[PDB]
């Protein structure tokens, strides 16, 4: 990435969407974010929104693993586990309670939905 920041080439939207799809944890994707910030790489505005959407989805499955680790040992979910189902992450760039924040930016008028 220091070589890519020196040559001054742009990373495409399909490149970074496939880059952060190979991240498993939430701490790993923040390493990729602060590397490309330190290396001063160039990208599109859709590449930045698809990157922060992957940071939003990685914290969601990170807390879903935590709320099921306490569910398997207790046998019943808590009120905080059921509140995570409805609300989710509050501080987010593209939250689910306002599904119109990807229409002007993305050319497909739809957020990229990844599955495992």
């Amino acid at each position: 990435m220091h070589l890519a920041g020196r040559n001054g080439r742009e990373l495409s939207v399909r490149t970074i969407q496939h880059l952060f799809a190979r991240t498993d944890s939430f701490a790993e994707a923040l390493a990729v974010f602060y590397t490309m910030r330190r290396c001063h790489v160039a990208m599109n505005m859709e590449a930045y929104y698809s990157m922060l959407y992957s940071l939003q989805r990685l914290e969601e499955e990170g807390w879903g693993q935590h709320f099921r680790n306490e569910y398997e040992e207790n046998g019943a979910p808590s009120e905080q586990a059921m509140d995570f189902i409805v609300k989710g992450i509050s501080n987010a760039l593209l939250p689910e309670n306002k599904p119109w924040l990807g229409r002007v930016m993305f050319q497909d008028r739809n957020v990229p939905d990844r599955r495992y």
Partner: protein, 251 residues
Amino acid sequence: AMEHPAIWLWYPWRMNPHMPQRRALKNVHGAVFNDLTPVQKKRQEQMLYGVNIPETRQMKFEEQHPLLAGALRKLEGQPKGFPFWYRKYPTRRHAYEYRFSIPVEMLDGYNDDVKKALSKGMMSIQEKQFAQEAMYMERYAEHDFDTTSPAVLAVKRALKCRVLRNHLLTNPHNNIIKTVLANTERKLNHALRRLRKVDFKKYWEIIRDHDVQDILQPPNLVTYRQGSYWKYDWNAGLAISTNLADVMDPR
């Protein structure tokens, strides 16, 4: 992984017939900047950052003068990359510390001469007046893209009246500036008189801070005795704007 099934017939007219989004984006960019009067396009250039630049990334001055607008040398060196600090500056009123509304994060690798030539001392008169406008726009805006609030419009009219009075001081023989000052003072009176009714706290703060207490005064006694000065509160739709539970006890 799997091979596709066989296509058994095909017609070329099936291949004969995202573009609604590409049409709507250029219609939005036309209605925001391109379909305005020049006095509105100047204030749109002052407020928003890249309203001049279309999706083709070629200006109207660049398409006719390419040797003057485009860069002469193409340097392969220090590519700045994507801005990760772009959340702090959505409008040009957020960064008035430097020239051309350039943020301080953009000036990192340059020497002190380039940073000194873009400082506050090298700003023009229009940039200093826009900095004075943005100083109050930081204080009285509802959201970051708000320019038409009454507390913002009143201080904008008052700064315009100050500019016209300062021009009439050094040049009292300018006859157009007399008429424009006489119109801007009436518009400032209208803006402050509606600000007094729709939000009294910001009006009282603006009155107290700038040492203008009698800026809302009746001109003539003969018209004031017949209630024509306060009838402006009725005719403008402002007679019941005050919430009585927050200032008095209405019992």
